[PDB]
Amino acid sequence: VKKEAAEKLLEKVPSDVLEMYKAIGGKIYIVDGDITKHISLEALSEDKKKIKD
């Protein structure tokens, strides 16, 4: 009789395609602190306000 030999049908593995999608990449955006300056006097005042006759 003649031997099969068996060279196989399956080629490589999914693992390369699996690794392709497995890509995670970079996520999220900068927020919160930004720059922050601010300056004006809407908080408190100062002006002569007494009483007399």
Partner: protein, 51 residues
């Protein structure tokens, strides 16, 4: 900026539903009568904290 709450306080609030509010002190001014024109005018300098 809005009020911030962390994680453990958030869990404790959603468990216990106990969130109370205290009034520590109140700022506020006096308006005084003017003998000049009768108009009662606010002194922004003076406050009821003095009084």
């Amino acid at each position: 900026t809005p009020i911030t709450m962390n994680y453990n306080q958030f869990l404790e609030l959603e468990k216990t539903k106990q969130l109370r509010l205290d009034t520590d002190q109140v700022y506020g001014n006096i308006a005084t009568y003017n003998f000049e024109n009768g108009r009662v005018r606010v002194d922004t300098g003076s406050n009821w904290s003095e009084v």
